[PDB]
Design a protein around this ligand. Sequence first.
Ligand code: ADP
Ligand code: ADP
Lengths: 248, 241, 241, 260, 260, 260
Amino acid sequence: MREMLQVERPKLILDDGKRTDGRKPDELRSIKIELGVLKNADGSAIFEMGNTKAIAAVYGPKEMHPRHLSLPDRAVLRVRYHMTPFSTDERKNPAPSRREIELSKVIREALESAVLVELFPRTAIDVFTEILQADAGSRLVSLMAASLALADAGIPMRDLIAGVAVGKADGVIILDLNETEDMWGEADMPIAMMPSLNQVTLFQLNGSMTPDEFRQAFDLAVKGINIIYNLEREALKSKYVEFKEEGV
Amino acid sequence: ERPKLILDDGKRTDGRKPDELRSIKIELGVLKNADGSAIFEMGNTKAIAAVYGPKEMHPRHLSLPDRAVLRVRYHMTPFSTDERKNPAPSRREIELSKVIREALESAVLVELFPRTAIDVFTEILQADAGSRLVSLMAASLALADAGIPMRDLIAGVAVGKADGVIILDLNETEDMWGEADMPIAMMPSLNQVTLFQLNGSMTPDEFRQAFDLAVKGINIIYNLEREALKSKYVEFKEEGV
Amino acid sequence: ERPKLILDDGKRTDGRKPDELRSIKIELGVLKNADGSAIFEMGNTKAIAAVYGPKEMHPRHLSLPDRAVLRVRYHMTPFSTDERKNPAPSRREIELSKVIREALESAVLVELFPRTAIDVFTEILQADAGSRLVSLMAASLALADAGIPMRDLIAGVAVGKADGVIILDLNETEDMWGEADMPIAMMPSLNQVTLFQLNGSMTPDEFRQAFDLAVKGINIIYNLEREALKSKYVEFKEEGV
Amino acid sequence: MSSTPSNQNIIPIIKKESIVSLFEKGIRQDGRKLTDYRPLSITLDYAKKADGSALVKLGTTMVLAGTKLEIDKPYEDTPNQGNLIVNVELLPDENAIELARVVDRSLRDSKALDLTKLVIEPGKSVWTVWLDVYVLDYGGNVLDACTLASVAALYNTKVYKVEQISVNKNEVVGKLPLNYPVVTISVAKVDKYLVVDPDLDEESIMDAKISFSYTPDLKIVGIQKSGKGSMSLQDIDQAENTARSTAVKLLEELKKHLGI
Amino acid sequence: MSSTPSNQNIIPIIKKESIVSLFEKGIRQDGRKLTDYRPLSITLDYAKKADGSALVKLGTTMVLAGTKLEIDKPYEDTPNQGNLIVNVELLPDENAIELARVVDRSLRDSKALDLTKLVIEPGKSVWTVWLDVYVLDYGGNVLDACTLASVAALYNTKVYKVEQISVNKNEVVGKLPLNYPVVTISVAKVDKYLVVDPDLDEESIMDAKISFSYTPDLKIVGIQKSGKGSMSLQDIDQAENTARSTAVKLLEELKKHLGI
Amino acid sequence: MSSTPSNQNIIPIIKKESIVSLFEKGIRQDGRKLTDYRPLSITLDYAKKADGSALVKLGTTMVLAGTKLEIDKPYEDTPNQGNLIVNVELLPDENAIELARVVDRSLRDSKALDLTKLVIEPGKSVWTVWLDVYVLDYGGNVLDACTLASVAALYNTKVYKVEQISVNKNEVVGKLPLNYPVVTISVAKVDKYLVVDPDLDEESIMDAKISFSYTPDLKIVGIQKSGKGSMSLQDIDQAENTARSTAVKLLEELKKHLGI
Ligand SMILES: Nc1ncnc2c1ncn2[C@@H]1O[C@H](COP(=O)(O)OP(=O)(O)O)[C@@H](O)[C@H]1O
Ligand SMILES: Nc1ncnc2c1ncn2[C@@H]1O[C@H](COP(=O)(O)OP(=O)(O)O)[C@@H](O)[C@H]1O
């Protein structure tokens, strides 16, 4: 009775076009952005994508502690991606995980392409980032919170950084993933851009994809990024933005 | 099953009245390769302290332009306790080090040695409560032995409440089962409180009593510190405050 | 339980007489991006050594005014042994590093490069005993390959005692169950002992025999090092001292 | 090895005299009297995935504290007790460790949380309360804000159904066994004045500060002197009177946020 | 805390212009076309005490990877799976950790190694595959060489007889449950050109590089953008076409080394 | 990663010649002959809470060593043995680790302590001897002082009643299974002279030193060459003759302190 065995993994695309959280494959989660929320930081921002909430603080161009570690021509970015023990369902150990170490390097390299470090030689810019709630896309929610906190700190950049995770769930390409979609989907592909320059700042894929899927997932991500970018520019003007989740 | 701590008339577990210090032993300049050294004993709590006197600081970016940087280490030897303490530093050793350093920073005239570091190492050889204070006093004396200028010497006792009775200078056992334990360290000649902590529970009125008793004890200890400075060696049998 | 070490014919576990070296393989300049490199193989013990040549030191306060600072790393790959050794450095790796550095410091003319650091990295790719010596020699050769001036080359063997018999160049098995294990490293042309250790047990008269034998072995190895310097590649089948 | 911090953020003698000259008139930079606490905001249940959380704004200082509950075997020494593990993190260690311990001590010694009610099957399985406190904005007097965030996070904590084996995290059984809130009041000694709840500026010009922990019936439950300087005998005496009459004010306000 | 490396040996504007002028003519310093891989050597069973090992020479880059097999209890979460633990070390961290993860991910997500076949007694005992990758010579494009050394080391691995509980290491039962090899192809974006398998010089002048992992049926199995700069949309598109048509040739060559 | 120490103190060429000119007349600064040990003090059970302790003064060098006994499960590898864990501290690492290992090795390989006698229940429970050695005063030749403190601390150790489940620490059963004491003798090579037990000054001008460990039966039980220089063949030969005829005198004296 192989006859009654039925896959353990849950269906991610359900009735109508729709998903586990009731979204269509081409809909973002709800977005909330707030700037200058920390008084003692040089620039700060809180970014929420659905249930993923990150806070980012920037401590603005300053002379570097041990001078041998500074750069003669550039500022040194110091980036910290970190998850609070209560960001997840079960408790994440506060001691840094190899995954946190990798994500920090990837986020730093992302910001390094946007921030004009060639303006502040012998200085260090410190970008701290906590994840207060993790529900997937947290490396992107973190990166964007950072980008905005930099802009809030008044630090010059080529462009703002906007990003979505695009994926494939039940053979269907979907935009902005749940933890559930991240768990059980075939593929999970975070993409971050400087939208006005069309420059890809961060780009990863874990999972499996055919070259064409990859290219479709690619076109959907851009569209999502473009909608998020608009809110970032808005949030820069008015310091506070709230966007109900909806179709790209 | 808890122990009775003050038995029906006055006497504690080690046969002391509520207002009696443990025996004190101090000797100075006991380490030959240190700039200043001291061993301090309060009953069964021994501590040794070495000072390595004002010197240029290793990585110059960590030095201070106007001040000396104090570097203080509180540490317990694995064989200082009943159960073998792990040599790797404990959160409690980390906190006690910060507390002791801040204590010494109020006494030592650091603004006299800019761009220098004064290193104060302290090890507890026997732990029987009050070890943070025995450490601090050993340090203070080792600094004086190193001939480093200070506002005053530091003297200190732990005062506590047991069976509802306020007691002076606690046991291993009194720290363990008493309702309160309040270490106090002073610069007695200036009436300056250098270190002050309380773990446990007290009413505002008993806090003020415990406070008064601690001062009296400190004054007696201070006198021995002063004697130990001139003669290098001091013994003192348990006595009433 | 417990194995035999020399057999009824007088041969060891790997079929060698008590006075025979393992097979030797040396090749130089094997790493492209290093300033000097070498692979050394004694029987089953293979070590690779890279040198990153005299260079301005990172944090200048750690440099020396008159000398170069040697920076030496002895390390075993997780797959060098039979049961996977942890990559995190062991107390044994930490000691061996210090011993190897002090060995190289006696040979390398550090006087010549003040305010600089010479890096010597060493990995063990297969461990079958004598790995601290195979490492040291690989390093010595890598330095010579990096064209760094030295008093002499360093050659070395582990001499030991199996079942009451003094033997030259040990197996993991002989290291494991032998009564003594004595690594010796020399600057053969100067008759200078660079490294010298003994773990196990020996009578003074035995110690002196094991010593003489070690010298003879060292002399044969030295010749191959001198060789390998001139031709970059040397093979040597096991033979009698 | 504990050493004098070289990021000693020095504040000029001239600016110090400006602030002291105001103290002499019983007023401060921010407008409050020598004995006033800063404006206090508490948002409960801020971190949604926590068992209970609280975001506290005391002036410009911000602390977020969150609890996370687990089922562990009780430790061999204390077989009929649950566990409380406090952990502090500064974001802008040693001061963190000290903050953690001071908070822990005052929550434990007051018995504000009763650990002996966190037992499920004695000797077999107990609740472990993970308290994690995150300082997001260092606006001075972090300790008092920590105690507040902690207490609030504990009062916001939801306990779940214990399926007999593990935890069923969508059925809420009840709250934590909490006897009462606890407040910590820091009094700074700047010059010859005693100042309640020092801000960023006041902390950098102070000699030392002393912190008193109180239960609602005004029992002293923890004291911690702190700072590179010293304080006189009648200073500590006076400080505690001030600290205590402040405590009453702060407790009623904490309770209003905490829903009685 | 991740910070811009203060090492990173800067390469003058004049030397960059020399290399780019060659790119414009579709040739490089080495001599190869913009899309060519470097010369590839693989020596199997190099580390004799490993269960399986492989020494890879891609250009001047040298990676040695070795496997070591062990029997442990499967981890409470994954009761019907063996373990794969990848570990990278640079010898001439953070880049190491990133390298380890990228390789791991592409070996695990492709299911090139089937962990569910490394079970001995389900829930009781499983195989743990320790993969350790050692970069001996940093000649640029270390990632591609690592993937090769890894895959090769796994294909060289020998599994031993199990006493059921105890390993008998001189009887060889079989090989690892390997479905297929995997290749990673890195494409660098130098100025306005895309360059396959960048060497040491090319990596120091590039804006960013992007790395594609492929299974033999040409499914993308991992992508990693890497480097201090950015890349355009059309660039990543083109890169992947180039990356994929390279993968075919590299796979055929890898297989020749691995014997079928 | 082991590197040449940058902050130990260089000693001028002029001062070196002064000391050597004295060696040339068979006398040293302090007054002793080239082959004499420094004055030796041993105070037993100095640390009262230790299960056996010894404070050793050799010249200006001071070592305090203390033992602490515990009951554990023996190692899966060594089921019929107790444990000895040596640990060295320097207070005024790497030299510490080296010191610990050299002492451990000579106590273990000599069989001075018989570990197979520290078994209570074979395979179930054995004694673990924690030996902790604290260098308080670095007066040169720390190694020799360490071996002495260690041996003395073990000879002072009290074993307790084993009461089933636990230990009853106020009933003394006996003392450690010790076969014999062990001495380590360090011989420094300064210039062209061999000098027994070098002091602080002699160690900083020496080429290298070599340390020999002896059982009372004058069997060599450990050798450790140490120092940033080299030694000739005849030097090591001569060194050991001197080292050994010294060992007899030092063993005598060690025994007198211990109560034979
Ligand atoms: N230690 C952990 N405990 C619980 N959940 C975790 C842990 N680490 C990661 N997660 C969950 O996995 C989600 C997705 O992680 P990942 O694929 O790295 O993407 P992102 O980092 O963009 O969220 C996280 O947002 C979080 O919900
Ligand atoms: N980890 C430990 N194990 C056993 N006993 C200890 C330990 N730590 C401290 N003690 C003993 O109990 C006392 C309690 O210490 P505490 O009150 O925290 O500080 P202090 O060391 O100043 O007394 C110590 O003085 C010591 O005698």
